Each structure stands twice: as C-alpha cells, then as structure tokens.
Amino acid sequence: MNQQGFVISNELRQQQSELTSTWDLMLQTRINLARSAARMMMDASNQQSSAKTDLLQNAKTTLAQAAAHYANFKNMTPLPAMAEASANVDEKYQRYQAALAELIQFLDNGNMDAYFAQPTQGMQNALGEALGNYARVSENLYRQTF
Secondary structure: OHHHHOHHHHHHHHHHHHHHHHHHHHHHHHHHHHHHHHHHOOOOOOOOOOOOOHHHHHHHHHHHHHHHHHHHHHHOOOOOOOHHHHHHHHHHHHHHHHHHHHHHHHHHHOOHHHHHHOOHHHHHHHHHHHHHHHHHHHHHOOOOOO
C-alpha cells in the first residue's frame, strides 16, 4: 500500500530516463552518419577503407546503444496511465530506428542517393513530438498525488 508509492516513482524515472538516453543516441547517430557521408562526399583526407571507418563505425555504436536503452523501455511493461503515450513512442521509435538503420546500410555500401533520398527529418520529428507527449503525461503522472 502506502510504501508502494516508491516503486511507481522510480519506474517513471527509469522509463523516462531511458527515453532521454535513447533519443540522444539517435540524434547521436544522425550526426555521425552526417559527418560520415560528408567526408564520404567528393573529397580526400582520410584515404582509408572505402566508406566505412571511425565516424560510420561510431553511428553503428550509438544506434546500438540507443536500441539497448530502448529494449529496456520496451520490456518493463508501462502502466494503464502510460499505456497510450507508450505505444505511441514505440510506434514512432520503430520507424526512426529502422530509418537510421538503413541510412547505415547505404553509407555502408556507398548508397549516397538512397542515404540522401530518405525523408529522415520527419521520422525524427514524429518521435520527438511523440516523446514530448509521453514526457507530458509522465511528468504529469504525479501532479495529483498529494
């Protein structure tokens, strides 16, 4: 009973903390890719490999890091109050995660057109918005416990 008002608080914290993390790494994959293709563009400098080293490799890491963070969120089932806001973020993460994953395939094999053809911004926009919605319900899921 009463003392159970501590396991709900901690969960809201961890579930949310997990989202801030994931989001970060995602936008932390987007720039590595960006910084990756940039140099992949018509230029020289690091004449090593052939479209796959440091920067490209770091995005493969960041996205994997975000995903592990996310898998936790996906695991520990939410609450009947975080229900909707949850499936929504999952729904948007699904798309934006797939998106970056593919961006990684392209840069990987040299698919510059494809890499630059993908409508990523909006994929990111949707999740960001869906993240704001969830953050709104989450932070609010306490403004009635006094």
